[PDB]
Design brief:
The structure is cut from a larger assembly and holds 2 copies of chain A (49 residues). Chain A is mostly beta strands and 49 residues long. The first copy, chain A, has no helices and 2 strands. Chain A has a two-stranded antiparallel sheet with strand order 1-2. The first copy, chain A, is elongated, with a radius of gyration of 13 Å. The PDB classes it as virus.
Chain lengths: 49, 49
C-alpha cells in the first residue's frame, strides 16, 4: 500500500448548486503511485467517484 | 448575467468596466464613444427669402 502523508486541502468556489457546487484540491506526499479510495466522514457534503 | 455602469461623455476616451462573479475569472470591458448627435424636435414656424 502506498503511504500517504501530509494531506491538506484548499477551496476554490463552493456555490450552492444542486449537482456539485465546488471543487476541492488535495496535496500530499508519497513514495510510489497506485490506487486509493476517498470518502467523507460527514453529511454536510458528498464527494464524487 | 446583469451589470450596470456609467461612462463620461467625452469623445475618444476608452472606459473600462469590470465584471466579477463566483465561479469564473474576472473580465473587463472596453466602451468607447465615437460620435454623438443632438437633433431638436423641429417645426418650421416660417421661411424667409
Amino acid at each position: 500500500a502506498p503511504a500517504v502523508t501530509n494531506l491538506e486541502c484548499q477551496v476554490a468556489v463552493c456555490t450552492h448548486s444542486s449537482d456539485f457546487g465546488g471543487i476541492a484540491t488535495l496535496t500530499f506526499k508519497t513514495d510510489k503511485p497506485g490506487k486509493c479510495a476517498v470518502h467523507s466522514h460527514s453529511n454536510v457534503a458528498t464527494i464524487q467517484e | 448575467y446583469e451589470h450596470t455602469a456609467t461612462i463620461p461623455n467625452v469623445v475618444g476616451f476608452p472606459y473600462k468596466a469590470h465584471i466579477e462573479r463566483n465561479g469564473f475569472s474576472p473580465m473587463t470591458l472596453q466602451l468607447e464613444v465615437l460620435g454623438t448627435s443632438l437633433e431638436p424636435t423641429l417645426n418650421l414656424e416660417y421661411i424667409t427669402c
